[PDB]
Design a protein around this ligand. Structure first.
Ligand SMILES: O=c1[nH]c(=O)c2ncn([C@@H]3O[C@H](COP(=O)(O)OP(=O)(O)OP(=O)(O)O)[C@@H](O)[C@H]3O)c2[nH]1
Ligand SMILES: O=c1[nH]c(=O)c2ncn([C@@H]3O[C@H](COP(=O)(O)OP(=O)(O)O)[C@@H](O)[C@H]3O)c2[nH]1
Lengths: 312, 301
């Protein structure tokens, strides 16, 4: 039953320890009827300074700060994430990959800059109200916690979201969509390339979701970009991922020698099946990302029209 | 949900800290042996949170546990499960600075730093003695030691197994020394509800003349081992605390107790008019002179 907090790096061990600690601490903190404004200004800091004790996996000295833990706890609730689920993805085994995901591919941990944290703060109340109003039906990143680790005297900022891709359905092509932007010829020769806009126009792929999925999605995307424009935020993106079900079968067969295209929308929340009339049987994952940074209203309109183009 | 609701804020931190350290420990494997560094180790944490969980806890405080591996092993060697210990400390605020846990099972005493340094000086030989006697001993049973810091004021504590029962109320109390010096109960101390009478007050009574047959011998052998060890460790000024329970007074099961829980407890011999509790106390202050005098006095009664 023992959490060893064994990782490859001490920052991952402290990360796992700190999530375990905060989730447990928070569990002794009652759930409030409503958030008060202090919850948006609060934090929890703890400093561990041990001696000749529990050195095997943790550093002997470190610090863990969790931002606005009441807000992020409520957000976890608003997103249908059980905190004990959350901690166990983080702590049952060391996350992997600064970009990290939890061992079970269910959550993403991105290290961020202090300015990112401050931006997160300036927006958090409007974000929480948006999350209330759209019941969590959104394409924006879904924030579950924000943390400052301190280890070796280096402070480290990290923000947790839901991974936009499925934890079960493997992703076969990736795109990051937002002037002419192309993926590096070096990146174009990587294993899973994060292909860009120009590469998509030259490939001319198109996602086939069928009117009903199309409509759900476009309505939430219009609301989201209007909301972002409202906070004067730019440089965000739409991450899109393709899972070709036939290939998933083939690769599972290769595995064998040495449901399919079914997924849980409760769990894989950005995911959509292809229209029943589709050429290839495919599953798509689509979300807005990178929301922590020539007009925001102009960019709103440009982004929205482009993303409106990519569907059927 | 543990609120850590207490009578005083330091009690809230005490409950928080025992809870925290024990949970932390549950994730530390139990080692084939204690190593020397465990007797020199400690765990310190500083909590400084802001607009958060302030309702019953302080926003800033610190908690140090001394030699937690050794003390965990002592809890085990004394047959205390950490989760029982944790629940006694944390399920409800302790009570009465001298404390017992809400359930009267464990004793929490504030101590001085000098006492703490003495404790460290003795811990290895003490632990080894507790090993050798399988825990069959009359000495105090140390279960944990901690330094609280709150508003910047540090506070030391040592937790032991309580001598009195968590169920049966105690009807007379005495604190015995055996000095050649004369120690009597204060007319002011005699003016408390449960007087801690000394030797002189105990000599004049017939229910105070205790009665026991075969158990007396093995009890005396264990008292001898303890006092010989203390004389050996250069400890003086220690005491024997004792309690009497007249079951008739309780009526006005009865006289039933679990010896697995109330370990210092003894039934009266059939040649009796009661149930008695007896242990050694005050042992953190550094002759064999005192050892022999003390042991001889306790040998007769
Ligand atoms: O708009 C905000 N509302 C807030 O409520 C808030 N709380 C923290 N921050 C940001 O925190 C980051 C560095 O960490 P921080 O300065 O908070 O650490 P700190 O206070 O312990 O000091 P030090 O340990 O680095 O010496 C910086 O981006 C601070 O602007 C906030 N920004
Ligand atoms: O929620 C998510 N689940 C994921 O699985 C995932 N995978 C990538 N991303 C984002 O894509 C960009 C990195 O692309 P990159 O080119 O590999 O890195 P960089 O741009 O620094 O060179 C950044 O926005 C990453 O946060 C993901 N977000």
């Amino acid at each position: 039953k023992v959490k060893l907090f064994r990782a490859s790096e001490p920052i991952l061990s402290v990360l796992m320890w700190g999530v375990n600690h905060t989730i447990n601490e928070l569990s002794n903190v009652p759930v409030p009827v409503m958030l008060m404004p202090d919850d948006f200004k609060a934090y929890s800091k703890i400093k561990v300074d041990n001696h000749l004790f529990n050195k095997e996996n943790l550093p002997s000295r470190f610090k863990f700060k969790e931002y606005c833990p009441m807000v992020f706890r409520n957000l976890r609730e608003r997103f249908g994430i059980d905190d004990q689920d959350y901690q166990n993805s983080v702590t049952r085994s060391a996350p992997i990959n600064r970009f990290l995901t939890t061992y079970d591919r269910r959550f993403v941990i991105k290290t961020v800059s202090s300015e990112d944290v401050a931006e997160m703060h300036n927006i958090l109340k409007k974000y929480h109200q948006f999350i209330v109003e759209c019941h969590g039906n959104t394409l924006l990143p879904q924030f579950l916690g924000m943390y400052r680790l301190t280890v070796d005297g280096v402070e480290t900022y990290m923000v947790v979201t839901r991974d936009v891709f499925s934890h079960r359905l493997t992703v076969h092509r990736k795109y990051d969509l937002k002037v002419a932007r192309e993926a590096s010829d070096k990146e174009k020769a990587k294993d899973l390339p994060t292909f860009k806009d120009n590469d998509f126009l030259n490939e001319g792929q198109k996602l086939h979701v069928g009117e009903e999925s199309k409509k759900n999605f476009l309505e939430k995307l219009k609301r989201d970009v209007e909301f972002l424009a409202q906070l004067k935020i730019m440089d965000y993106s739409l991450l899109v991922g393709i899972h070709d079900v036939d290939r998933a079968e083939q690769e599972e067969m290769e595995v064998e020698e040495r449901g399919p295209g079914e997924f849980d929308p409760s769990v894989d929340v950005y995911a959509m099946k292809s229209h029943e009339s589709s050429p290839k049987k495919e599953v798509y994952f689509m979300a807005i990302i990178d929301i922590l940074t020539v007009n925001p209203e102009q960019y709103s309109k440009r982004f929205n029209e482009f993303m409106s183009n990519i569907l059927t």
